[PDB]
Enzyme design. Structure first.
Site, PDB file in Angstrom:
ATOM      1  N   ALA A   1       0.836  -1.197   0.000  1.00  0.00           N
ATOM      2  CA  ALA A   1       0.000   0.000   0.000  1.00  0.00           C
ATOM      3  C   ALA A   1       0.881   1.261   0.000  1.00  0.00           C
ATOM      4  O   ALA A   1       0.609   2.230   0.737  1.00  0.00           O
ATOM      5  CB  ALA A   1      -0.962  -0.007   1.169  1.00  0.00           C
ATOM      6  N   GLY A   2       1.877   1.269  -0.898  1.00  0.00           N
ATOM      7  CA  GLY A   2       2.763   2.409  -1.088  1.00  0.00           C
ATOM      8  C   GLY A   2       2.210   3.347  -2.136  1.00  0.00           C
ATOM      9  O   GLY A   2       1.015   3.324  -2.424  1.00  0.00           O
ATOM     10  N   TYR A   3       3.071   4.180  -2.720  1.00  0.00           N
ATOM     11  CA  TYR A   3       2.666   5.117  -3.777  1.00  0.00           C
ATOM     12  C   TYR A   3       2.052   4.371  -4.943  1.00  0.00           C
ATOM     13  O   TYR A   3       0.949   4.687  -5.358  1.00  0.00           O
ATOM     14  CB  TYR A   3       3.867   5.947  -4.271  1.00  0.00           C
ATOM     15  CG  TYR A   3       4.352   6.960  -3.264  1.00  0.00           C
ATOM     16  CD1 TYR A   3       3.598   8.089  -2.961  1.00  0.00           C
ATOM     17  CD2 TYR A   3       5.541   6.769  -2.576  1.00  0.00           C
ATOM     18  CE1 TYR A   3       4.052   9.037  -2.053  1.00  0.00           C
ATOM     19  CE2 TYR A   3       6.012   7.715  -1.667  1.00  0.00           C
ATOM     20  CZ  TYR A   3       5.259   8.843  -1.395  1.00  0.00           C
ATOM     21  OH  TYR A   3       5.735   9.748  -0.461  1.00  0.00           O
TER      22      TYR A   3
ATOM     23  N   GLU B   1      19.128  15.559   0.354  1.00  0.00           N
ATOM     24  CA  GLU B   1      17.937  15.957   1.116  1.00  0.00           C
ATOM     25  C   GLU B   1      18.140  15.676   2.607  1.00  0.00           C
ATOM     26  O   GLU B   1      17.779  16.515   3.434  1.00  0.00           O
ATOM     27  CB  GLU B   1      16.683  15.209   0.628  1.00  0.00           C
ATOM     28  CG  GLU B   1      16.111  15.728  -0.673  1.00  0.00           C
ATOM     29  CD  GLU B   1      14.626  15.486  -0.805  1.00  0.00           C
ATOM     30  OE1 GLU B   1      14.145  14.456  -0.290  1.00  0.00           O
ATOM     31  OE2 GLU B   1      13.935  16.341  -1.400  1.00  0.00           O
TER      32      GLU B   1
ATOM     33  N   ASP C   1       8.999   0.783  -7.391  1.00  0.00           N
ATOM     34  CA  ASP C   1      10.427   0.449  -7.244  1.00  0.00           C
ATOM     35  C   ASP C   1      10.781  -1.018  -7.567  1.00  0.00           C
ATOM     36  O   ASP C   1      11.959  -1.349  -7.632  1.00  0.00           O
ATOM     37  CB  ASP C   1      10.932   0.861  -5.846  1.00  0.00           C
ATOM     38  CG  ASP C   1      11.330   2.327  -5.773  1.00  0.00           C
ATOM     39  OD1 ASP C   1      10.681   3.160  -6.451  1.00  0.00           O
ATOM     40  OD2 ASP C   1      12.356   2.624  -5.151  1.00  0.00           O
TER      41      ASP C   1
ATOM     42  N   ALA D   1       8.655   8.090  -6.675  1.00  0.00           N
ATOM     43  CA  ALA D   1       7.232   8.101  -6.261  1.00  0.00           C
ATOM     44  C   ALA D   1       6.348   8.656  -7.412  1.00  0.00           C
ATOM     45  O   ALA D   1       5.218   8.245  -7.562  1.00  0.00           O
ATOM     46  CB  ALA D   1       7.036   8.958  -5.012  1.00  0.00           C
ATOM     47  N   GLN D   2       6.887   9.573  -8.227  1.00  0.00           N
ATOM     48  CA  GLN D   2       6.180  10.176  -9.364  1.00  0.00           C
ATOM     49  C   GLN D   2       5.828   9.125 -10.440  1.00  0.00           C
ATOM     50  O   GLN D   2       4.677   9.047 -10.848  1.00  0.00           O
ATOM     51  CB  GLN D   2       7.049  11.296  -9.955  1.00  0.00           C
ATOM     52  CG  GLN D   2       6.278  12.244 -10.871  1.00  0.00           C
ATOM     53  CD  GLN D   2       7.091  13.442 -11.312  1.00  0.00           C
ATOM     54  OE1 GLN D   2       7.223  13.719 -12.512  1.00  0.00           O
ATOM     55  NE2 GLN D   2       7.561  14.244 -10.355  1.00  0.00           N
TER      56      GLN D   2
ATOM     57  N   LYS E   1       8.086  22.264  -3.557  1.00  0.00           N
ATOM     58  CA  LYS E   1       8.220  20.944  -2.935  1.00  0.00           C
ATOM     59  C   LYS E   1       6.977  20.648  -2.048  1.00  0.00           C
ATOM     60  O   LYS E   1       6.464  19.529  -2.069  1.00  0.00           O
ATOM     61  CB  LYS E   1       9.516  20.889  -2.116  1.00  0.00           C
ATOM     62  CG  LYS E   1       9.792  19.586  -1.408  1.00  0.00           C
ATOM     63  CD  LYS E   1      10.614  18.699  -2.178  1.00  0.00           C
ATOM     64  CE  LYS E   1      10.746  17.361  -1.520  1.00  0.00           C
ATOM     65  NZ  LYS E   1      11.259  16.398  -2.497  1.00  0.00           N
TER      66      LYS E   1
HETATM   67  C1  LIG Z   1      14.083  10.233   1.711  1.00  0.00           C
HETATM   68  C2  LIG Z   1      13.624   9.938   0.308  1.00  0.00           C
HETATM   69  C3  LIG Z   1      13.253  10.988  -0.522  1.00  0.00           C
HETATM   70  C4  LIG Z   1      12.696  10.755  -1.786  1.00  0.00           C
HETATM   71  N1  LIG Z   1      12.225  11.840  -2.508  1.00  0.00           N
HETATM   72  C5  LIG Z   1      11.591  11.606  -3.629  1.00  0.00           C
HETATM   73  C6  LIG Z   1      10.967  12.725  -4.307  1.00  0.00           C
HETATM   74  O1  LIG Z   1      11.040  13.896  -3.956  1.00  0.00           O
HETATM   75  N2  LIG Z   1      10.235  12.391  -5.429  1.00  0.00           N
HETATM   76  C7  LIG Z   1      10.077  11.124  -5.942  1.00  0.00           C
HETATM   77  O2  LIG Z   1       9.307  10.991  -6.899  1.00  0.00           O
HETATM   78  N3  LIG Z   1      10.694  10.042  -5.319  1.00  0.00           N
HETATM   79  C8  LIG Z   1      11.396  10.281  -4.199  1.00  0.00           C
HETATM   80  N4  LIG Z   1      11.890   9.221  -3.482  1.00  0.00           N
HETATM   81  C9  LIG Z   1      11.704   7.849  -3.998  1.00  0.00           C
HETATM   82  C10 LIG Z   1      10.366   7.261  -3.573  1.00  0.00           C
HETATM   83  O3  LIG Z   1      10.190   7.367  -2.160  1.00  0.00           O
HETATM   84  C11 LIG Z   1      10.200   5.812  -4.032  1.00  0.00           C
HETATM   85  O4  LIG Z   1      10.595   5.666  -5.394  1.00  0.00           O
HETATM   86  C12 LIG Z   1       8.786   5.289  -3.779  1.00  0.00           C
HETATM   87  O5  LIG Z   1       8.658   5.054  -2.376  1.00  0.00           O
HETATM   88  C13 LIG Z   1       8.410   4.058  -4.573  1.00  0.00           C
HETATM   89  O6  LIG Z   1       7.017   3.822  -4.330  1.00  0.00           O
HETATM   90  P1  LIG Z   1       6.586   2.261  -4.148  1.00  0.00           P
HETATM   91  O7  LIG Z   1       5.109   2.131  -4.011  1.00  0.00           O
HETATM   92  O8  LIG Z   1       7.177   1.440  -5.268  1.00  0.00           O
HETATM   93  O9  LIG Z   1       7.299   1.730  -2.829  1.00  0.00           O
HETATM   94  P2  LIG Z   1       7.169   2.060  -1.281  1.00  0.00           P
HETATM   95  O10 LIG Z   1       6.909   3.500  -1.081  1.00  0.00           O
HETATM   96  O11 LIG Z   1       8.518   1.612  -0.705  1.00  0.00           O
HETATM   97  O12 LIG Z   1       5.945   1.220  -0.658  1.00  0.00           O
HETATM   98  C14 LIG Z   1       5.969  -0.214  -0.620  1.00  0.00           C
HETATM   99  C15 LIG Z   1       4.909  -0.660   0.353  1.00  0.00           C
HETATM  100  O13 LIG Z   1       4.908  -2.105   0.410  1.00  0.00           O
HETATM  101  C16 LIG Z   1       5.007  -2.518   1.761  1.00  0.00           C
HETATM  102  N5  LIG Z   1       5.715  -3.790   1.804  1.00  0.00           N
HETATM  103  C17 LIG Z   1       7.013  -4.010   1.425  1.00  0.00           C
HETATM  104  N6  LIG Z   1       7.378  -5.265   1.476  1.00  0.00           N
HETATM  105  C18 LIG Z   1       6.243  -5.919   1.929  1.00  0.00           C
HETATM  106  C19 LIG Z   1       5.962  -7.280   2.160  1.00  0.00           C
HETATM  107  N7  LIG Z   1       6.834  -8.266   1.929  1.00  0.00           N
HETATM  108  N8  LIG Z   1       4.724  -7.597   2.604  1.00  0.00           N
HETATM  109  C20 LIG Z   1       3.830  -6.620   2.776  1.00  0.00           C
HETATM  110  N9  LIG Z   1       3.974  -5.308   2.575  1.00  0.00           N
HETATM  111  C21 LIG Z   1       5.212  -5.021   2.143  1.00  0.00           C
HETATM  112  C22 LIG Z   1       5.721  -1.380   2.482  1.00  0.00           C
HETATM  113  O14 LIG Z   1       5.510  -1.481   3.885  1.00  0.00           O
HETATM  114  C23 LIG Z   1       5.077  -0.171   1.797  1.00  0.00           C
HETATM  115  O15 LIG Z   1       3.826   0.167   2.388  1.00  0.00           O
HETATM  116  C24 LIG Z   1      12.544   9.429  -2.239  1.00  0.00           C
HETATM  117  C25 LIG Z   1      12.948   8.378  -1.414  1.00  0.00           C
HETATM  118  C26 LIG Z   1      13.481   8.610  -0.151  1.00  0.00           C
HETATM  119  C27 LIG Z   1      13.855   7.440   0.719  1.00  0.00           C
END
Ligand SMILES: Cc1cc2nc3c(=O)[nH]c(=O)nc-3n(C[C@H](O)[C@H](O)[C@H](O)COP(=O)(O)OP(=O)(O)OC[C@H]3O[C@@H](n4cnc5c(N)ncnc54)[C@H](O)[C@@H]3O)c2cc1C
EC number: 1.6.5.9
Length: 398
Positions: free
Chosen positions: A9-11, A168, A298, A315-316, A375
């Site tokens: 439940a991420g982005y 950052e 990711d 995240a975008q 931002k």
């Molecule tokens: C400090 C920081 C700053 C950043 N700034 C930017 C920015 O300004 N702009 C930008 O676009 N990107 C930015 N990023 C990158 C961005 O945060 C990631 O690319 C983004 O989080 C990817 O989204 P996601 O849904 O793939 O993964 P995630 O956000 O990592 O979410 C994954 C989800 O899955 C859950 N999960 C994981 N493994 C399991 C499992 N085995 N079982 C159950 N649940 C699980 C996690 O708990 C989470 O809820 C930044 C990253 C960091 C760390």
């Protein structure tokens, strides 16, 4: 009524669910969303939570609050196995079947085989790591103040990586370290903040003018940069780095790795052709040999039409990918063909404390307060894009 199973439940995953739940009918499909935690966290705000400039509760909100409960079953559980052929996903709270799968398990630290970097450094991965790191930093200032010794290496911080996340984090340290110094009776001049980057350039996604702004900003506030400097190991004392090929121990009471990330470890265990937890998808975000399995965020490596390298992990793209998946799941359910994903580069801002930053917005470079304001608009728009104006008012940056 096909079972649409969303992992994470991420982005990426939460955006897919909030869009898809509005478009499907209840009898059309059953949506099931699995997540480690009860909350969704703003991973893009973990620089603030790790430094301690923002309270951890402010980077997260309950997942269930944004769900249409008659269409979505929220399962708080950790995914432990994905069987792509049996159409089953195992978790610590039971096994779930699927017709359509959406893998959006996010990222974890990637340390490039550097010995001791996971064992002896703090990572930037989630709310729990951020809480441990902010507490560790203040505890180092509080222990320095309690001791008769006064070892100034307790006040030394190493940051691995001069990329987006590292820069950052350094920006947040430049706001926090002065407060902690004054709170704990320490002279700021005794603090050492060092950023070590193996790569020849800092923040490669921006122009040279924009990098100089971020370098000047951080240098004026005590950050020392060691660019084109490989980190060959991390031990309890700090980083072992190479200067002109000669190994050198750098000492720090706090070591932070921000130079690399990878997709979930479940990716290599579950799917073929995975490199660094990322799978190269088809143009509709499905995977080779599986028109019923989407991999986004990711965990994905989306190569745009006509290009060779995948777009960076952001995240975008993750949110843009979730919207695309939600529209293609609707098409599949109605017997329609999928459409290709097309990333729209909206631009971004790298923050430098609360009132500065460097970025690109509308194809134009921006810095300073203008960047810091933009931002906050981008961060708040991501809260809106998933949970609406109500959630944006409550949890946004305004
Ligand atoms: C400090 C920081 C700053 C950043 N700034 C930017 C920015 O300004 N702009 C930008 O676009 N990107 C930015 N990023 C990158 C961005 O945060 C990631 O690319 C983004 O989080 C990817 O989204 P996601 O849904 O793939 O993964 P995630 O956000 O990592 O979410 C994954 C989800 O899955 C859950 N999960 C994981 N493994 C399991 C499992 N085995 N079982 C159950 N649940 C699980 C996690 O708990 C989470 O809820 C930044 C990253 C960091 C760390």
């Amino acid at each position: 009524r096909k079972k649409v199973l969303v992992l994470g439940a991420g982005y990426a995953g939460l955006q897919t669910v909030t869009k898809l739940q509005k478009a499907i009918s209840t009898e059309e499909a059953e949506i099931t969303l699995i997540n480690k935690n009860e909350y969704h966290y703003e991973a893009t705000w973990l620089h603030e939570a790790s430094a301690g400039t923002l309270n951890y509760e402010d980077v997260l909100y309950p997942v269930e609050s944004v769900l249409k409960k008659d269409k979505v079953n929220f399962v708080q559980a950790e995914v432990t196995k994905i069987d792509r052929d049996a159409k089953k996903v195992e978790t610590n709270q039971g096994i779930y079947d699927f017709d359509i799968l959406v893998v959006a398990l996010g990222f974890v630290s990637e340390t490039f085989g550097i010995e001791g970097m996971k064992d002896h450094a703090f990572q930037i991965e989630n709310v729990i790591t951020a809480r441990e790191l902010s507490r560790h930093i203040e505890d180092k200032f509080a222990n320095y103040a309690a001791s008769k010794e006064k070892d100034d290496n307790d006040l030394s911080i190493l940051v691995g990586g001069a990329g987006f996340t590292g820069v950052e984090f350094l920006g947040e340290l430049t706001d926090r370290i002065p407060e902690l110094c004054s709170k704990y009776g320490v002279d700021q001049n005794k603090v050492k903040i060092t950023c070590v980057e193996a790569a020849p350039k800092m923040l490669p996604m921006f122009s040279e003018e924009l990098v100089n702004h971020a370098v000047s900003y951080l240098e004026d506030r005590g950050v020392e940069f060691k660019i084109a400097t490989p980190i060959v190991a991390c031990n309890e004392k700090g980083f072992v780095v190479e200067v002109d090929g000669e190994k050198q121990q750098l000492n720090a009471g706090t070591s932070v790795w921000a130079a690399g990330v990878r997709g979930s470890k479940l990716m290599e265990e579950s799917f073929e052709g995975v490199k660094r937890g990322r799978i190269v998808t088809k143009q509709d975000l499905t995977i080779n040999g599986y028109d019923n399995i989407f991999v986004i965020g990711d965990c994905s490596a989306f190569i745009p039409a006509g290009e060779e390298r995948p777009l960076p992990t952001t995240a975008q793209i993750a949110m843009q990918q979730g919207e695309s998946v939600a529209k293609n799941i609707k098409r599949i359910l109605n017997g329609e063909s999928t459409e290709e994903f097309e990333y729209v580069d909206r631009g971004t801002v790298c923050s430098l404390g609360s009132h500065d930053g460097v970025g690109m917005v509308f194809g134009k470079p921006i810095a300073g307060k203008k960047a810091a304001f933009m931002k906050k608009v981008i961060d708040t728009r991501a809260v809106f894009k998933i949970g609406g104006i109500g959630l944006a008012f409550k949890k946004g940056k305004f």
